[PDB]
Design a protein around this ligand. Structure first.
Ligand SMILES: [K+]
Ligand SMILES: [K+]
Ligand SMILES: [Mg+2]
Ligand SMILES: [Mg+2]
Ligand SMILES: [Mg+2]
Ligand SMILES: [Mg+2]
Ligand SMILES: [Mg+2]
Ligand SMILES: [Mg+2]
Ligand SMILES: [Mg+2]
Ligand SMILES: [Mg+2]
Ligand SMILES: [Mg+2]
Ligand SMILES: [Mg+2]
Ligand SMILES: [Mg+2]
Ligand SMILES: [Mg+2]
Ligand SMILES: [Mg+2]
Ligand SMILES: [Mg+2]
Ligand SMILES: [Mg+2]
Ligand SMILES: [Mg+2]
Ligand SMILES: [Mg+2]
Ligand SMILES: [Mg+2]
Lengths: 95, 98, 283, 290, 60, 128
RNA sequence: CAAGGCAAAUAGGUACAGCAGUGAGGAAUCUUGGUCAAUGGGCCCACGCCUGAACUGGUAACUUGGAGGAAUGAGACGUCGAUUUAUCGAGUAAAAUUCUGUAUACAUAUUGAUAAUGACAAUAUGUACAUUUGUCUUGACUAAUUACGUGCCAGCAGUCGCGGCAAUACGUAAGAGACUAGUGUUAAUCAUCAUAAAUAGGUUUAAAGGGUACUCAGA
RNA sequence: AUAGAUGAGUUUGGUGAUGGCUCUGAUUGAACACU
């Protein structure tokens, strides 16, 4: 899944992507599904807030997957740890 | 006239009675004052029991029923018998020995 | 005359698929064959599903004798042979039924048993143990623990599993308390303190054995406390069982799942779709 | 009444995979395509294709309407946790650094280094992905008739339902005539010995027994349904596999439903002759049946 | 205690499950029951539970 | 809009949309019986060309609507009790209803083999 | 007590929105049954009487749940459909054989109830029987194809649309896709619709800033 | 109660917007047609 939530706007087409827990599946549209299935994502929940232009929809959601918040940059910026509770609890990353 | 009686609930050929405390002149299945317990007429059989015995499941709140009986509640014939078995009241009918 | 499709079928079924007519070799003979981890794959297109091994006939007896004759705790037998407590208990139940059949002079399915056991991979326990039968520490993935939470904490904080459980929820426990054999952790802590292995196993047995006593005690008190509320009044024909209960525990608005009585104000739901009208459990 | 959907059950043209040990089914499963081409097809066309393939095997004798409600979006899973790591470490090292963990050098720098870096501290095998996609038809494994077919007691799901409907199985030592009984963890279903021998036994050819009445060990009996001496079905070894959520006893033809099928990090306990790509598409179909 | 538990029932060998190992979602139960009455008040010790109260309202 | 303007009732229901078959949608009825008043031919509009088989019907309620006769050839005339169902002839202005063909007096197509249910045609019974 | 309807005549009853039932209206909704055995109620010292509530039987696919058959079946070395007479299909399909005894039928027992009373049925056990397909769709949305006929005609159509002489869309034929004792259509409701937006919208050029700002109430 | 949030067709020579209509899902104390 992706990191957190992203919202990208491309000339009237807004796409909101959320990171869902494991076993949620690609409960997304047909165009987003092809991209998630191809990039390697398996759990996501998208939404077209304003417009559903086929082209801009693909440009906005592709630009959203490249704008995910980097937990390590946010940590060094705030001087605070951003610990993934899921990893500490299970003593590793459960893929 | 407060009465301890049975409200019949269930489907066709599947009776399931509900012990209630309701005024005499009221609908049988109307919402009563209290629901003391439930009664199941059809006798059951222990799961892993081949002897052939049978029992009847009755969930009754003895403590609550006793209070109502002490203030003048009149249980019906069917409920009176059930209370007799528990020992709250004396039997209303007895088998003739002669 | 056979069509080409049928003709090709018998062509494949005569040379390539002939090895599946009779089972000559012992062990799985599936289509996928041996995988990367040495497990037969029944369906080639699906590599994840594998033909996992089954306890051999002689293995089931070893587990049965240990629990019954030696009276060892189930947790210890599970940890010893790396068999799940739920499976160890089942083998005993199934074995007890066998004793009944043999005691009642019933014919067993020996011809069928031997034939099927040669088609499934087996794990003979005892001396020649190569791998553990299965994982005895699997912990259910709780729904709360599946969320993606990045908690901002101090740069030098020692975030532990205890703190992780509290971040997921308030009532959640760490994975150290969800194990089916939690005594293993305590046993492994003795090895870190350079404790002799012999004494480490001694403490393990006592710990598990002591744990089974508590479980039995709780179960005993429960069943004994459930029969104290039931009044059995034998009669001419049947035996009436009057169960007691607090008739005031109907919640604050009358709606409560664990209440006793037929609810008022509900129409029969027989007409709704997917209405379960079958027994849900056999006691 | 044979319905129009069963007109072509093992057709070689359509090449469907069915839950049975029929030799025709074995040929279809063996020679099935490696990967159906789904590039040109649209999203609906892909989902519809996956639905047809998977539904030809999973619960084929269950009305589409019923299974649509039975499909659960709750895919259970477990995680293995060894006690060794629990004792030594308390999960503090997994947060060192910036929260995600102490970074390690890239793969292209390590090969140049003569000595490999120290291994990262974590549970053994804690990076493999868990196959959630291959768990869609898990609720069907709880059916009493499917569970019997997975215990190698019947030759197919259809035949496994016959035994239940005809009063041959007994759950927890009690007759169970309902093929839809959803087994609970701990239940013990036991099939009659005779029905299991006939199902898995070889066909009784009257011609083969003609030369047998004249010419451990079991004697030949000409008054039994299966062929004597009993022998396994011709093509039973290609489907001989027991799932991990069952503990069968061949002798008494009884099994225990230990738990529900669960997905572990590296495998799945749901028999399915379909790749994750197909199950993933099928799962999407039943989210909104479109 | 009527009859010993046979090896068929699941209660032959009790293996308690670990805490938080299942997520069964119970369905909402339709209907309600009448709320029994509060015989006593919410504060103070009522006169009905004194030494002699049944001998004063139900004398022999 | 501000929270104050919403207390004063600024959120009114959207303007209703006219239904396809008002006569039926009004009283929530799936069909209505009516006495045929006229059996005629209506002409399509800009794109389409042909001759549709409409019929002026007087419903039980009292309204006089113009229905449409689906199929090839009909059996209705003046003063024919016919059953009217919803629908609309897209290319015929003023025609917003259909007529059930297995209805009281309107007979289904006798030479129909495909989609008989839609035209009220009993099975041929060739062998039976 | 008054009025009208039916009945009534020198009388002064009746209104089935009590149960069953009839006519009418309508697209459309049931038996003029049995019993007070069970539960409840009225009267009664007691026994007991009464109960169209109620419990039971009947009618309807209106809905839901379940059954409605599984395994074997290759050389009848046949039949059919196409057509590249040898390719592609009907086809493991059929026949045939080997088993089961599901709904249901019958029989026995128990039980609904006990002080005693059983209208009617439920459950368990035993034996016995292998019984129908129907329907929509097939240009795209939307899973699934050719041939012929028709020639902006006849017709299809939820939306965009199709049909003017070699129509994948109309009508037949075959095939295919799909649901199934149901399948479609019509009507309605929620959702789709952030499509009256409190959560949660918008108003330069697209629906929408009052001609203006001093100001009571009110924010 | 922590898995629950999804789109498609149609305006234009064409593109991006605005904005309705319709389909995709579920259902009925339903009726009708073919069974
Ligand atoms: K257009
Ligand atoms: K103006
Ligand atoms: Mg828009
Ligand atoms: Mg138009
Ligand atoms: Mg056809
Ligand atoms: Mg009247
Ligand atoms: Mg009436
Ligand atoms: Mg009429
Ligand atoms: Mg009575
Ligand atoms: Mg009475
Ligand atoms: Mg009396
Ligand atoms: Mg029977
Ligand atoms: Mg009487
Ligand atoms: Mg298509
Ligand atoms: Mg048509
Ligand atoms: Mg056509
Ligand atoms: Mg049905
Ligand atoms: Mg202005
Ligand atoms: Mg003005
Ligand atoms: Mg222009």
């Amino acid at each position: 899944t992706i990191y957190g939530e992203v919202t990208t706007k491309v000339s009237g087409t807004i796409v909101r992507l959320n990171s869902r827990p494991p076993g949620f599946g690609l409960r997304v549209s047909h165009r987003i599904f092809e991209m998630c299935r191809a990039a390697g994502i398996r759990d996501l929940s998208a939404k077209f807030l304003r417009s559903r232009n086929p082209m801009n929809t693909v440009k906005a959601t592709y630009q959203a997957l490249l704008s995910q918040p980097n937990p390590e940059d946010l940590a060094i910026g705030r001087g605070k740890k951003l610990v993934d509770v899921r990893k500490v609890y299970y003593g590793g990353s459960v893929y | 006239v407060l009465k301890l009686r049975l409200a019949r609930f269930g489907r066709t050929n599947a009776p399931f009675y509900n012990i209630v405390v309701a005024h005499a002149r009221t609908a049988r299945n109307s919402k009563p004052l209290e629901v003391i317990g439930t009664y199941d007429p059809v006798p059951k059989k222990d799961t892993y029991d081949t002897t052939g015995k049978l029992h009847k499941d009755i969930k009754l709140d003895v403590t609550r029923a006793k209070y109502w009986i002490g203030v003048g509640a009149q249980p019906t014939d069917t409920v009176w018998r059930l209370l007799s078995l528990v020992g709250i009241l004396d039997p209303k009918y007895k088998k003739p020995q002669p | 005359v056979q069509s080409v499709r049928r003709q090709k079928m018998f062509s494949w079924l005569d040379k390539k698929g002939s090895a599946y007519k009779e089972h000559t070799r012992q062990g799985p003979n599936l289509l996928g064959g041996q995988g990367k981890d040495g497990l037969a794959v029944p369906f080639p297109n699906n590599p994840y599903f594998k033909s996992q091994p089954v306890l051999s006939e002689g293995s089931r007896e070893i587990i049965y004798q240990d629990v019954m004759e030696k009276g060892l705790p189930i947790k210890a037998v599970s940890a010893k042979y790396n068999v799940d407590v739920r499976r160890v208990a089942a083998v005993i139940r199934l074995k007890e039924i066998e004793k009944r059949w043999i005691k009642e002079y019933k014919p067993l399915a020996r011809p069928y048993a031997r034939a099927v056991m040669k088609m499934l991979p087996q794990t003979v326990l005892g001396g020649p143990d190569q791998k553990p039968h299965e994982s005895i520490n699997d912990v259910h993935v709780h729904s709360y623990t599946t969320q993606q939470l990045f908690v901002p904490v101090s740069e030098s904080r020692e975030f532990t599993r205890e703190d992780a459980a509290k971040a997921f929820g308030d009532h959640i426990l760490p994975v150290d308390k969800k194990l089916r054999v939690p005594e293993l952790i305590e046993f492994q802590k003795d090895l870190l303190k350079e404790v002799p292995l012999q004494e480490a196993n001694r403490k393990f047995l006592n710990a598990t054995a002591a744990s089974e006593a508590k479980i039995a005690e709780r179960e005993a008190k429960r069943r004994q406390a459930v029969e104290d509320a039931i009044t059995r009044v034998k009669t001419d024909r049947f035996e009436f069982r009057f169960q007691e209960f607090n008739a005031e525990n109907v919640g604050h608005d009358g709606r409560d799942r664990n209440a006793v009585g037929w609810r008022y104000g509900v129409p029969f739901p027989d007409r709704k779709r997917s209405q379960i009208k079958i027994p849900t459990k056999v006691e | 009444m044979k319905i129009r959907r069963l007109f072509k059950y093992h057709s070689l043209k359509k090449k469907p995979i069915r839950p049975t040990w029929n030799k025709y089914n074995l040929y279809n499963l063996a020679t099935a395509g490696r990967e159906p081409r789904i590039s040109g097809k649209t999203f609906f066309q892909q989902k519809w294709l996956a639905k047809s393939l998977t539904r030809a095997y999973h619960g084929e004798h269950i009305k589409e309407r019923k299974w649509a409600r039975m499909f659960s979006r709750r895919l259970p899973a477990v995680v293995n946790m060894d006690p060794a790591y629990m004792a030594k470490y308390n999960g503090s090292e997994q947060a060192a650094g910036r929260g995600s963990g102490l970074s390690e050098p890239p793969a292209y720098e390590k090969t140049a280094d003569e000595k490999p870096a120290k291994q990262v501290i974590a549970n053994p095998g804690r990076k493999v992905p868990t196959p959630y996609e291959q768990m869609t038809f898990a609720p069907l494994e709880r059916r009493l008739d499917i569970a019997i077919f997975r215990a190698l007691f019947a030759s197919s799901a259809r035949q496994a339902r016959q035994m239940v409907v005809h009063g041959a199985v007994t759950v927890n030592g009690k007759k169970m005539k309902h093929p839809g009984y959803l087994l609970n963890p701990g239940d013990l279903f036991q099939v009659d010995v005779e029905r299991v021998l006939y199902a898995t036994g070889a066909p009784k050819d009257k011609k083969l027994l003609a030369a047998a009445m004249k010419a451990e060990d079991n004697e030949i009996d000409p008054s039994k349904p299966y062929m004597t001496p009993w022998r396994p079905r011709n093509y039973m070894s290609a489907f001989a596999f027991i799932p991990r959520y069952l503990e069968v006893n061949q002798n008494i033809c009884a099994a225990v439903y230990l738990r529900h099928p669960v997905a572990r990090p590296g495998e799945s306990e749901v028999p399915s002759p379909f790749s994750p790509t197909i199950n993933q598409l099928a799962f999407n179909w039943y989210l909104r049946r479109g | 205690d009527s009859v010993s538990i046979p090896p068929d029932s699941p209660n032959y060998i009790k293996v308690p499950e670990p805490p938080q190992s299942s997520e069964v979602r119970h369905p909402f139960v339709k209907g309600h029951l009448p709320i029994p009455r509060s015989i006593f008040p919410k504060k103070g010790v009522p006169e009905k539970v004194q030494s002699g109260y049944v001998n004063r309202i139900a004398p022999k | 809009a501000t929270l104050n303007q919403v207390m004063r009732g600024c959120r009114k229901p959207q303007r209703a949309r006219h239904a396809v078959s008002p006569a039926l949608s009004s009283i929530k009825s799936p069909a209505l019986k009516g006495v045929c008043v006229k059996v005629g031919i209506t002409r399509p509009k800009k794109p389409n060309s042909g001759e549709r088989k409409t019929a002026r019907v007087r419903l039980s309620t009292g309204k006089v609507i113009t229905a449409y006769i689906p199929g090839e050839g009909h059996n209705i005339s003046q003063h024919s009790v016919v059953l009217v169902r919803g629908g609309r002839a897209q290319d015929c202005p003023g025609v917003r209803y259909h007529l059930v063909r297995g209805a009281l007096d309107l007979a289904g197509v006798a030479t129909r083999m495909s989609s008989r249910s839609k035209y009220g045609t009993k099975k041929p019974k060739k062998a039976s």
